[PDB]
Design a protein around this ligand. Sequence first.
Ligand code: NA
Ligand code: NA
Ligand code: NA
Ligand code: NA
Lengths: 448, 448
Amino acid sequence: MSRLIVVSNRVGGLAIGVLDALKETGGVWFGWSGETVSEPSAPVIEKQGNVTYATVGLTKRDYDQYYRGFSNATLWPTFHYRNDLSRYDRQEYAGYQRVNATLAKQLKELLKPDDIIWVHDYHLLPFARCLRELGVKNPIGFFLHIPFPVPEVLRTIPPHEELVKAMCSYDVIGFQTDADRQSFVDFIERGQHGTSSEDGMVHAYNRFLKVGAYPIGIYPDAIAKAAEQFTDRKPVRSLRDGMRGRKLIMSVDRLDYSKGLVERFQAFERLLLNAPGWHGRVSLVQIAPPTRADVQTYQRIRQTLEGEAGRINGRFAQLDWTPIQYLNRKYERNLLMALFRQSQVGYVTPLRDGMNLVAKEYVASQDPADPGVLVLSQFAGAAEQLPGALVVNPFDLSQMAEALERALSMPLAERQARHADMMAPMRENNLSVWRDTFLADLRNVATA
Amino acid sequence: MSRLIVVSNRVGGLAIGVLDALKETGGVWFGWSGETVSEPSAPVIEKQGNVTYATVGLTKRDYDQYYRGFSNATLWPTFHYRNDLSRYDRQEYAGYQRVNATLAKQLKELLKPDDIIWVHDYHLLPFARCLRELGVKNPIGFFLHIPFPVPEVLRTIPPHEELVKAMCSYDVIGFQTDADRQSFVDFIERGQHGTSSEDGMVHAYNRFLKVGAYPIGIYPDAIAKAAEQFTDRKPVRSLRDGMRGRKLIMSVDRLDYSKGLVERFQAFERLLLNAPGWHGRVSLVQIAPPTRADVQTYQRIRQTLEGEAGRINGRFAQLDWTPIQYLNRKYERNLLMALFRQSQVGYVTPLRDGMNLVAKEYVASQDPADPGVLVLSQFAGAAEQLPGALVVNPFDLSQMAEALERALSMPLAERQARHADMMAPMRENNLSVWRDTFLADLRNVATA
Ligand code: NA
Ligand code: NA
Ligand code: NA
Ligand code: NA
């Protein structure tokens, strides 16, 4: 059978999504190694079982222009509906194109005629067009892990037209949600670049391609088992002993403006103002791992958040109670699931998220004999897939505060029914379904 | 014939748009007087010729919640695609609804059964629903002067669903551009609230209504005449004498984040870096009248802009040349047209504008024997109506700098052809056409 060739930027997260298919097909995982090198070298080949890893370094200039620059300082903020934070630079965009072309040229040397190629995320929008320019005829699929912004927002990116054209060199394009798919198709149709056809097909820029929504899932019963197996670890026992007599609201996210952590803190403050009986009886733990602390944008968001924790704690703290426990550190994944299992409320209200997996993991971590309650943003991508979550508009601090209060006081029978209602579709649309449904479409391209 | 009843917030700009129709129909202009009062009073009636003015004051609380609060701190930033600057407060939204209801109750006392009612802009979205609740059956039309944001952005406003429902109590809804109309209809259709019908008709919330684009125009030949008649005024002679031997780039806008004045300054800086031969041979005049300086949002934008002028001047100034002349003051309208006529480049590149009239006024002010060149944002609403403008993406500083350079060096014959190409549609779709086309649709509602 065809080797699966996976292409991504740093070569678990994506790993748990693709590695089984790589192993089944004896495939190749190709991309940047994450290291900067003085001079480029040929890809380093490392076989691990049935899987071949092929990675390359990038010069500092390539890294600054392609990764720090166009990918993370232009595409990332705009695709998260914050083009006010975006900056465009022609030289960075040129390097973004140059790196895509260089990687495609090096991947081509490793390709066999039967391979199918699956490319991941916004760093690699033009990668299929680079491959077609090299004469590569293999099936190529793309999956975008973050939102795809509607045309009024997309068009603020100066080379947006060239990017969408290049994306249609892919045979299959997958997005997280139907709204992302419709956003992409809207651009094409309303710009008179192409038309919609049957069965998700699109005719644009002299090519046909399939465009679909494939929301990424989890393995909910594996998470449940891991959360239980890691409950008897020292950090979990520490959390439990420190929280005795109090309910725990747990919030975990990278320190990004798209996560709305200031709003999360402020709605918790509003809860304490609305319901003074909760003082000393609830705490908010915010875990915010060290993110892209090199960016001046992220340093500012972090300083803002840190001051809000200080302000709210100063306002409500007692000599034996810190309302917001803010921790700037990373926990091992299985341990984190055990921490979710200890938490009566999972507080997952990003302003914009392609598909927040923390919401699914929080729910699947719960003890079904005594499950906690998920409070979820309507902009997290995951709400339609989690019937039973308390869904809120994070721009409405009062609604969020009232959902925290509802979550904290919810009776067991209703908490169990909500948890069951969310577990069932997560089991039905689990991570294997995501991978297999995308790959079946990719294997349906070349069928004559 | 039916009296025209105009409803707006401060009771020229709108005046030049409506006053002729008020005079022809012996109509009424109703709304808030702009003053805050301790206790509300009945509307003050003042007849001026054939027109009746009926105005009321608002308490400080009503003004803070309805005008400063929900209108200007929630709707205005979000409709200009800056929901990151928006803040939502339930009490402010309640006052917004309360003021709309109070004004509608007072207007109803002045209505005759034959009147047609024309309501203006985002302060008054629910006004027609308030009137219907009072049993008012008259034709009611609405015109929105600012953009209507696409659903992904609109839905960040927490009560957005109630607002769109209320808007469909209007018989006619007008927007500045087709994209605004499609944004509104997209919300209704994709939320399964209603359907599109023939001839711009919409069926939603158990009502039919007409929804259209009516881009607001100017009187271009009146502007041309005023600009010429005010050329021999002292401020114009001062400008001319101070600019001798240099080309003038003129930029005029309220000091708002939607105007992109920092980007305007930075692209001018990029021009000076790209083309050092222009040093001492061109100046940028930025007129930025005192705006909503009470808002802390606007104080920050102003401080940012002021520092950018200081930085760029410090970098490039010579002992007899200030690159950016920034003036925080207002000029009388006819005098301003004369200043446009003195300017070789009109620099109108807002990040988001419902319909920038400065672009149309700048062009119509020009001497056709020696006309200046318009550089225009693709997000200003006015670009489709000004064929011949140099249209730019304001998020692309290099493109804007290169358009300034192209404008500054453009030969007379091409400058004249561009000016002619823009004057012709401005004459054809002038302000009278705007008013008459909207009013004909409003008078077509009750026709049995
Ligand atoms: Na428990
Ligand atoms: Na969505
Ligand atoms: Na002249
Ligand atoms: Na537009």
